[PDB]
Amino acid sequence: YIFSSDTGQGHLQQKSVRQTTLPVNIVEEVHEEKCYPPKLDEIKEQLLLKRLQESASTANRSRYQSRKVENMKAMIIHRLKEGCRLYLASDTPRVPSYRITYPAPIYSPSINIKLSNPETAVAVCNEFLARNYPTVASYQVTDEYDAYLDMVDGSESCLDRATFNPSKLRSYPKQHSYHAPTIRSAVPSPFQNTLQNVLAAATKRNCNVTQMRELPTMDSAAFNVECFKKYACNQEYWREFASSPIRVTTENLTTYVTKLKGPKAAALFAKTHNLLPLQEVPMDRFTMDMKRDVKVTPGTKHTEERPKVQVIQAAEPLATAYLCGIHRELVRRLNAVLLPNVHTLFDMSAEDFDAIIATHFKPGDAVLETDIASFDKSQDDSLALTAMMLLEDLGVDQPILDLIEAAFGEISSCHLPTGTRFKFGAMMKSGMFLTLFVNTLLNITIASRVLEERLTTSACAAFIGDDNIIHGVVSDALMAARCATWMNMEVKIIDAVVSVKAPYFCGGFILHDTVTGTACRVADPLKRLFKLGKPLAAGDEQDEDRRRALADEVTRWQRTGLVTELERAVYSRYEVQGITAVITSMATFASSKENFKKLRGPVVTLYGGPK
Amino acid sequence: YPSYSTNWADEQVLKAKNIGLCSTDLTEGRRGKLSIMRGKKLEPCDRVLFSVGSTLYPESRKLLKSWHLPSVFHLKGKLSFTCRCDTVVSCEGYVVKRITMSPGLYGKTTGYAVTHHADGFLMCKTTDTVDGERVSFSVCTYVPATICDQMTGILATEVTPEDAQKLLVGLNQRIVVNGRTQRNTNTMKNY
Amino acid sequence: DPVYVDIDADSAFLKALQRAYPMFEVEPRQVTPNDAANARAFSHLAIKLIEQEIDPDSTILDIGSAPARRMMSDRKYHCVCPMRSAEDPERLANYARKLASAAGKVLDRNISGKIGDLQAVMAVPDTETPTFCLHTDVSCRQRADVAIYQDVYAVHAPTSLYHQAIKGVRLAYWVGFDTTPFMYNAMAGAYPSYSTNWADEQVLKAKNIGLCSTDLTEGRRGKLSIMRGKKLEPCDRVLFSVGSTLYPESRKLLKSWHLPSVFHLKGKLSFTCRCDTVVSCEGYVVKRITMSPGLYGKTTGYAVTHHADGFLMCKTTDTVDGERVSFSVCTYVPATICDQMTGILATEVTPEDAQKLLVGLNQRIVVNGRTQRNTNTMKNYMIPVVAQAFSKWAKECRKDMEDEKLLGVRERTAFKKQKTHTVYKRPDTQSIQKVQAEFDSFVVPSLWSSGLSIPLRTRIKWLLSKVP
Amino acid sequence: PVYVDIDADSAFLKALQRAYPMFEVEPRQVTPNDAANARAFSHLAIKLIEQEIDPDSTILDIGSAPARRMMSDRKYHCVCPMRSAEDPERLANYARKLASAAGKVLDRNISGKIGDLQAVMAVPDTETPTFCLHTDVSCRQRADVAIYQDVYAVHAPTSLYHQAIKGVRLAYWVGFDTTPFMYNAMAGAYPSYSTNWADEQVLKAKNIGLCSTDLTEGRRGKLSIMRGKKLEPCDRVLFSVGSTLYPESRKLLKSWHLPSVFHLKGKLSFTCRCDTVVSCEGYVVKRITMSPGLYGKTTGYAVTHHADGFLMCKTTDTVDGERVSFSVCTYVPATICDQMTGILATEVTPEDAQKLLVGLNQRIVVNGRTQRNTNTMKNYMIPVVAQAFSKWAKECRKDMEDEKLLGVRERTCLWAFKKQKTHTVYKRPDTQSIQKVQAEFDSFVVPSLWSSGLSIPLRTRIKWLLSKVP
Ligand SMILES: Nc1nc2c(ncn2[C@@H]2O[C@H](COP(=O)(O)OP(=O)(O)OP(=O)(O)O)[C@@H](O)[C@H]2O)c(=O)[nH]1
Ligand SMILES: Nc1nc2c(ncn2[C@@H]2O[C@H](COP(=O)(O)OP(=O)(O)OP(=O)(O)O)[C@@H](O)[C@H]2O)c(=O)[nH]1
Ligand SMILES: Nc1ncnc2c1ncn2[C@@H]1O[C@H](COP(=O)(O)OP(=O)(O)OP(=O)(O)O)[C@@H](O)[C@H]1O
Ligand SMILES: Nc1ncnc2c1ncn2[C@@H]1O[C@H](COP(=O)(O)OP(=O)(O)OP(=O)(O)O)[C@@H](O)[C@H]1O
Ligand SMILES: [Zn+2]
Ligand SMILES: [Zn+2]
Incomplete structure (x- = not known):
């Protein structure tokens, strides 16, 4: 997710495109990446398969999958191209674009410090938890009978416009096997797929009705786009972009499918026999998915109240494959119209982010961080109109806009195992292929309107998802009065000062180095610490990608000139002392395969076995 | 001269195909043709045709080249004069020249002419088809300064x-x- | 007291020009699309600096000047204007026309005296007058205090200075191009800030230099030659091109103005002289020279140049008339580029x-x-x-x-001995050369003859016949 | 307030302010000089000296220009012979300034100075309380303070002794640092003042601050003849301060690196000390006090304190087409060394x-x-x-x-x-360097090299210029 996940896969790429070998900033030109067209070959597969049988040590098998997957990719292109005959177009001359590059970052040396006995590391971590979090360290006294306790008490829900069968509401637990954790953090296990959990998750009541597409709604949207184009964008690209539309093209589909992996291509291939046309695919029908992981934050709140259940609304598989070739062009056009001091995390890597903010943040500087998650976007219909107006200005072809618009109105969801039907009104968060883009556009628009001209005169601004940071801005009564037109809790704002109250961004800390004198971003150690106290399901063999992720994260923590700063940042955020010992404990855990085995224990089986 | 929609060409290449002033027709190809006379020479002649937008003007090379005067020259006949030549205005092909005469002989002459280029000037050799036959000759033009710098x-x-x-x-x-x-x-x- | 220059209002040369003259304030105003605007702005400011520095009660001599631009001046000028170039008749006619036109209107700059003085010289073209003269710098017999040279490259410097000294001249000035590239014995060069290019006659048919012209009809093998040259060395003749104007020069006379710090002049009388540099801006320098009677101290014979920006000299390969050769070139580089x-x-x-x-x-x-x-x-x-x-x-x-x-x-x-193909002088670096510092040659190029024609005298007199 | 001809946004202003914490400094630029930094320091040095001197005594000036001492409220006796090729210009300038201001300024005896100049011009060999035409040895005048400003052409022990027998008890010296020449270096630079100096034998180098070379093709083998086989520094050194050339000698430069305590022995005996009071990136100000009699004992050691980094290394270059090696010295800022x-x-x-x-x-x-x-x-x-x-x-x-x-x-039993190799000497900031020198002088020379000084053509011009005094 964004920077890096627990398995070190992340959402960002790993190729630098914003690096230069000169001590000054240089403007360059954006180019295109050529893609190899797949080709079909059956005679090679037949002979290789027979040659696979006679001798295959290690690389002989790999040639078979590469040949087999390559055949599947060619077949998908041939079938997919025929469906969208009424929307296919050709290549028109492109509009050139330019971008700015920055010099490479400088880092301080790192020294490794670790203990020897792995059991002592567990004792230190347990001592740290008890001293700082007394209630959390005394919760576990028996096994994990959460499923049984949830069945004993009844079902409480707050639904709206839903139907279900009462005869299928039964929640007797099934077999559950896991490994007993060693760290005394009480991280819950993922929930079981039952009808009771589905109703508990859908306990949200956002029933609000306003003017759908009337005159007052249009007036608010018209003002919003005016502020965005006046305080956050330059005027050198609008007229050129309107002349050249964006349409579905063979190159878009060929490039997209080639980027998929093995298993993903096979899954898509299985749904190409009865291929519906593009105009036949419904755009307002979704399916319900439950398989998720619970989210826990440092503190003592999960030992008193049960956490919520996460859900996913999945769209049609063919809908996200026909039109997913226009995401790259939309990103390029958006980056071209933004001001040089306004940045977006799309199409960057970890190193590029460090080089941009290398010489901007210094001690004693005020930074404003604001999130917009706590806001009901379903109350006002103008939030959807504003996004469409921005999309139309960017140069989206007219019939394609109708297909996109159909997914932002009335939608329905269904649960296949139980046949449960749900209906929702205007919704912004979903599982479609424009979710981050629309959220980023709305985040910039909200900030631009509230801050007015204070956004233009700034040193560095970064926007991604629902989080943002703006340099050199404080909190005054003018923004409170402007934002209090409807209510007061639209957004949450926090004031931060470098080297005194470290700013928080995307689950990390922004710190200023001492030896070199440059800014850098590091991860959150407490978030990792609670995560090692999560039970591991039996039969899982993913205990090697996590060790490498921990090893990389530990090295970044032990850089010289950042030990003292990290201590103060954690204390000013969570009011906790003594994290250097925890970091040392993490170092010895991620040193060998056998040292990582001390975080687990004997296997415990519940609700299973007729003995 | 692209800025003024002016094209000029020699009389011997008026039947070209890919120049600013030419006209040809469609042929299927005739392998081998009769030739009463022999050629082997292709050099510019004295006849030049001008087209300023839509009007035709015939010109001569010798009279055209006589106005490219040097900086200093002497006119000595029954009476003697000493005179100069300067350029005051130039814009993408059009120039204005000023000449001042004075009686008597003074100084020394060197016989050199200097032209200052504010725009790119190009002269290349191209291959074309004149009346069904492949030949080669040279062309010239002007290029804007901004394009050259980039x-x-x-x-x-x-x-x-x-x-x-x-x-x-x-x-x-x-x-x-x-x-x-x-x-x-x-x-x-x-x- | 602002000064107006005839350049564009958005030119990048304003920053350099203002920094070289911090005692003024420069204001731009464009009235003519001249191709050598930068070269004329520097000369205009240089004269203003010199005029205010000197005593306004002395007499000034001009060598090879145009009297037309010295009319509206409150100082005293003695113009030495021989007739040895094709531009002199035009300048003399313009001077007469302006004097008659501005007669009776501006009665403050001594217009009547200048008009009467010019007529006297026309009648007898051998008299010496306070305002006008018709001899050379050697044959002139007028005594003054200050001598000024402006863009003069046709006079031997030690000889001219000695003849001025014996008439009681104690100060001198010189404005012109930098002579450093000619001390390194280069073949071609450029001054990109002022749109100036120079080259030798032997490389006038090059292909990739600033001043050349080649042909296209070619592609053959074998060119019989009688003489076996095998030699490419610089010769005396050098051609200059400023904007769209051509100027022939000679190497020997150009190198004579690269004077050392201290030198002696010996002859009938003895003097000691010093040379100093006051203003330097990307190719133009302003030098001040003082003379004093007698002999004092000892000389060393060394010349020092200070580089504010990069100076570069390299070796290039090109084709001259179709034959591949090699020679050296030089240019100037901005300081910011060199640092990065x-x-x-x-x-x-x-x-x-x-x-x-x-x-x-x-x-x-x-x-x-x-x-x-x-x-x-x-x-x-x-x-x-x-x-x-x-x-x-x-x-x-x-x-x-x-x-x-x-x-x-x-x-x-x-x-x-190793091989060297590049000489690079970074900013804040000095170069030193060895020159001559003792001169005693009292040559007498005294062959006086007038160069005024009868038709020219008639035209000048006729323009002054009518007082309006 | 003190005004210096420096650019308003230069980095040298901060360093100059730290060296003089008793004044307030403001910039005022009126001339694009190539050695503006070197002139600012000297201007401030004179102000400091005059602030701690009793205004009742008289001050001698050795090798000074009388033009810049005119509008002052103190008493100066200018000693200036005619031995330089730029001295007659200074004398003419002095006469012109005096004549141009005869009744406009009533600061001090402007008319008295004019009368003093005329008396010296009448008869050369005379002593005047304002002007003189002798050397530092032949002059006969009583005073209390002597000032040496940028003097490198006199012997230090010899000059000091002759001033002491006349009653002088305090002296000052302003100039460049001497330490680089005590290490026997071949070339060096002062980057802050745009100054480069080099030996005469390496003037045809390629990659130093003061050199000039030409292009060559690489002819292998020119001559054998004289076998040099040796390359050592000589006594002739050349300086370049911005754009001006100055030839100097090594022996006279090294004679000003005086010890802390030394004795002057002769007909009369004196004891004296030396001390450095101001130091800024190459310029130093030295104060010397003398007293009659012999006291204490000497050790013969000179100590310098480094506030910046001093570097001396061995480099390989190509002199006139031949590869050689020699030593180069330079200065480094303190912040760079720390990081x-x-x-x-x-x-x-x-x-x-x-x-x-x-x-x-x-x-x-x-x-x-x-x-x-x-x-x-x-x-x-x-x-x-x-x-x-x-x-x-x-x-x-x-x-x-x-x-x-x-x-x-x-x-x-031979033992x-x-000896190991050494190719770099590096003196970090907050470090001291010590040298061994001589601290006992008892041999002096008394020449008589003063024939006439002036000439007749120059004297006539000066009299004519001063003739129009009313
Ligand atoms: N090499 C060389 N340069 C010259 C000479 N005379 C003038 N220049 C320079 O040419 C530059 C452009 O001035 P010009 O275009 O000649 O016009 P002008 O000097 O105002 O007057 P004219 O001499 O009548 O042309 C001047 O700034 C001079 O520095 C010369 O005799 N030789
Ligand atoms: N090595 C050396 N440096 C000198 C000498 N005299 C002056 N300087 C330095 O030269 C610098 C600039 O002075 P200049 O302008 O070149 O000499 P000037 O023409 O006599 O005028 P001033 O600035 O008053 O000295 C001064 O700061 C001095 O430190 C000298 O005799 N030898
Ligand atoms: N000995 C001299 N004394 C005074 N003026 C002179 C002298 N010689 C030449 N001049 C003047 O210098 C100016 C330049 O003319 P010059 O004699 O050099 O011939 P040119 O070829 O026209 O110019 P140049 O050779 O510099 O390119 C003329 O106006 C001339 O009157
Ligand atoms: N013995 C002396 N006493 C007083 N002043 C002296 C003496 N010798 C030289 N000077 C002064 O030194 C100044 C210039 O130095 P010098 O006489 O050595 O000439 P120089 O060739 O320029 O040498 P340098 O460049 O080292 O100064 C002159 O003004 C001169 O009056
Ligand atoms: Zn005369
Ligand atoms: Zn005296």
Whole structure:
């Protein structure tokens, strides 16, 4: 997710495109990446398969999958191209674009410090938890009978416009096997797929009705786009972009499918026999998915109240494959119209982010961080109109806009195992292929309107998802009065000062180095610490990608000139002392395969076995 | 002269195919043709035709070249004079010249003429088909200064004609100035 | 007291011009699209500085000047105007027309005296007058205190200064181009800030220099030649091109103005002289020379030049009339470009790689959209030459560290001389040369003859016949 | 307030303010001089000296220009013979200034100075309380304070003795530092004042601050003839301050590196001391006090205190087409040296050292507004400095890998010791350097090289210029 996940896969790429070998900033030109067209070959597969049988040590098998997957990719292109005959177009001359590059970052040396006995590391971590979090360290006294306790008490829900069968509401637990954790953090296990959990998750009541597409709604949207184009964008690209539309093209589909992996291509291939046309695919029908992981934050709140259940609304598989070739062009056009001091995390890597903010943040500087998650976007219909107006200005072809618009109105969801039907009104968060883009556009628009001209005169601004940071801005009564037109809790704002109250961004800390004198971003150690106290399901063999992720994260923590700063940042955020010992404990855990085995224990089986 | 929609060509190549002033017809190809006389020579002659937008003007080379006067020259006959020549105004092909005469002989002459280029000047050799026969000859033109400056980066390597054509088309719509971006506004003719 | 210059209001030369003259304030105003605007702005400001510095109660001599531009002046000027060029008749006619036109209106600048003085010289073309003269700098017999030279390259310097000294001249000035490139014995060069190019006659048919012209009809094998040259060395004749104007020069007379710090003049009388540089801006210098009777001190014979920006000289290969040859060129580089290439030149770099870096630094640099490098700092037609020089310079610096030798000793096998293809002078660096510092040749080029024709006298007198 | 002809946004202003914390300094630029930095320091030095001197005494000036001492409220006796090729110009300027202001300024005896000048011009060999035409030895005048401003052409012990017998008890000296010449270097530079100096034998170098060469093809073998086989510094050195050339001698330069205590013995005996009071990146101000009689004892040691980094290394260059080697010295800012301690703990190649130095010079340390990303140090000494650090790190590693016993020395019954290599000398900030010199002088010379001084054509012009005095 964004920077890096627990398995070190992340959402960002790993190729630098914003690096230069000169001590000054240089403007360059954006180019295109050529893609190899797949080709079909059956005679090679037949002979290789027979040659696979006679001798295959290690690389002989790999040639078979590469040949087999390559055949599947060619077949998908041939079938997919025929469906969208009424929307296919050709290549028109492109509009050139330019971008700015920055010099490479400088880092301080790192020294490794670790203990020897792995059991002592567990004792230190347990001592740290008890001293700082007394209630959390005394919760576990028996096994994990959460499923049984949830069945004993009844079902409480707050639904709206839903139907279900009462005869299928039964929640007797099934077999559950896991490994007993060693760290005394009480991280819950993922929930079981039952009808009771589905109703508990859908306990949200956002029933609000306003003017759908009337005159007052249009007036608010018209003002919003005016502020965005006046305080956050330059005027050198609008007229050129309107002349050249964006349409579905063979190159878009060929490039997209080639980027998929093995298993993903096979899954898509299985749904190409009865291929519906593009105009036949419904755009307002979704399916319900439950398989998720619970989210826990440092503190003592999960030992008193049960956490919520996460859900996913999945769209049609063919809908996200026909039109997913226009995401790259939309990103390029958006980056071209933004001001040089306004940045977006799309199409960057970890190193590029460090080089941009290398010489901007210094001690004693005020930074404003604001999130917009706590806001009901379903109350006002103008939030959807504003996004469409921005999309139309960017140069989206007219019939394609109708297909996109159909997914932002009335939608329905269904649960296949139980046949449960749900209906929702205007919704912004979903599982479609424009979710981050629309959220980023709305985040910039909200900030631009509230801050007015204070956004233009700034040193560095970064926007991604629902989080943002703006340099050199404080909190005054003018923004409170402007934002209090409807209510007061639209957004949450926090004031931060470098080297005194470290700013928080995307689950990390922004710190200023001492030896070199440059800014850098590091991860959150407490978030990792609670995560090692999560039970591991039996039969899982993913205990090697996590060790490498921990090893990389530990090295970044032990850089010289950042030990003292990290201590103060954690204390000013969570009011906790003594994290250097925890970091040392993490170092010895991620040193060998056998040292990582001390975080687990004997296997415990519940609700299973007729003995 | 692209800026004034003016084209000129020699009389011997009026039946070309891919120049500004020519006209040809469709043929299927006749292998071998009769030739009463022999050629083997293709050099410019004294006859030149001008076309200023839509009007035709015949000209002569000798009289055209007589007005490219040097800086200092003497006129000595029954009476003697000493005179100079200067250029005051120049704009993409049109120039204004000033000449001042004075009686008597003074100084020394060197017989050199100097022209200052504010725009790129090109002269290349091209292959065309004149009346069904392949020949080669030279052409010349003017290039805007902005295009030439932006063209310096890639000319340090070997570039194929196809690659150069694509970049010229793209460079004809957008340029970079003072760290910012705008349209060219000084475009060149596509033909 | 602002000064108006005839240049564009958005030219990048304003910043350099203002920095060289911090005692004034420069204001732009354009009225003519001249092709040599930069070259005339410097000369206009140089005269203003000189005039206010000197005592306004002395007499000033002009050598080869145009009297038309000295009319509206509150000082006293003695113009020495011989007739040895094709431009003099035009200047003399313009002077007469302006004097008659402005008669009776501006009665403050002594117009009547100038009109009467000009008529007297026309009647008898051998008299010496306070305002006008018709002899040369040697034959003139007028006594004054200050002598001024402006863009004069046709007079031997030690000889001219001595003849001025014996008439009681204690101060002198000289305004012109820098003579440093001619001391290194180069074949061609350029002054890109002022649109000036110069070359030798033997390379006038080159292909890739600033002043040349070649042909296209070619492609043959074998050119019979009678003489076996095998030699390319600079000759006396040198051609200059400022804007769209041509000026022939000679190397010997150009090198005579690169005077040392201290020198002696010996003859019937003896003097000691000193030379100093006051203003320098990308090619133009202003020199002040003082004379004093007697002999004092001792000389050393050394000339020192201070570089504010990079000076470069390299060796290039080109085709002259179809034959491949090699010769040396020189140019100037801005200081900002030189500083930013310090880190790149630490290793060996390919010439094509250096060219790409130079292009980005020149026209593709941005900081905040306010100043940048004005998107054009160095003219684009000299980049390929510069890129070649840096590549060779870096390569030759690495070989030095691989041939480490002992201290205070030298090895003879009888010693080998290495090869040098690039001379690079970085900013804040000085160069020293050896010249002559003792002059005693009292040559007498005294063959006096008038150069005024009867028809020209009639025209000048007729223009002054009518008082309006 | 004191006004200095310096650019309003220069980096030298901060350093100048720290050296003079008793004044307030403001910039006012009226001339684009190439040696503005060198002139500002001298102007402030004179103000400091006049602030701690009793205004009742008289001050001698050795080799001074009378033009710049006119509008002062103190008493000066100018001693100036005619031995330089720029002296007659100074005398003419002095006469012109006096005549141009005869009744406008009533500061002091302007008419008296005019009368004094006329008396000296009438008869040359005369003594006047304002002007003189003798040397520092032949002059006969009583005073209390003597000032030497940028004097490098006289012997220090000899000149001081002759001033002491006349009753002078306090002296001052303003000029360049002497330490680089005590190390017997071949070339050097002062980057802050744009000054480069080099030996006469290496004037045809290629990559130093003061040289000039030409292109050659590479002819292998020219001559054998005279066998040089040796390259050592000579007594002739050339200086270049911005754009002016100055020839100097090594013997006279090294004679001003006086010890802390020394004795002057002769017909009369004196004891005296030397001390440095002001130091700023190359310029120093020295104060000397003398007293009759012989007291104490001497040791013969000179000590200098380094506030910045002093570097001396060995370099390889090509002089007139032939490869040679010699030593070069320079100065380094303190901030650069401090930020380099961590890197020098290992073995670093010269290529890496160049890259870090460039990055530190532009991005780190230095910044600003509008005028942004200035340079802390000049870029034409970066290649030389980078190589010096590389050799220093290598030499510090061999010392730890080859240990010796405590309190003993290892020899080789013939016994001898081996000498190691040394290619770099580096003096870090807050470090002292000590040298051994002579502190007992008892031999003096009294020549009579003063025939006439002036000439008749110059005297007539001066009288004519002063003739129009009313
Ligand atoms: N090499 C050389 N340069 C000259 C000479 N005379 C003038 N220049 C320079 O030419 C530059 C452009 O001035 P011009 O275009 O000649 O016009 P002008 O000097 O105002 O007057 P004219 O001499 O009548 O042309 C001047 O700034 C001079 O520095 C010369 O005799 N030789
Ligand atoms: N090595 C050396 N430096 C000198 C000498 N005299 C002056 N300087 C320095 O030269 C610098 C600039 O002075 P200049 O302008 O060149 O000499 P000037 O023409 O006599 O005028 P001043 O500035 O008053 O000295 C001064 O700061 C001195 O430190 C000298 O005799 N030898
Ligand atoms: N000995 C001299 N004394 C005074 N003026 C002179 C002298 N010689 C030449 N001049 C003047 O210098 C100016 C330049 O003319 P010059 O004699 O050099 O011939 P040119 O070829 O026209 O110019 P140039 O050779 O400098 O290119 C003329 O106006 C001339 O009157
Ligand atoms: N013995 C002396 N006493 C007083 N002044 C002296 C003496 N010798 C030289 N000077 C003064 O030194 C000044 C210039 O120095 P010098 O006489 O050595 O001439 P120089 O050739 O310029 O040498 P340098 O460049 O080292 O100064 C002159 O003004 C001169 O009056
Ligand atoms: Zn005369
Ligand atoms: Zn005296």
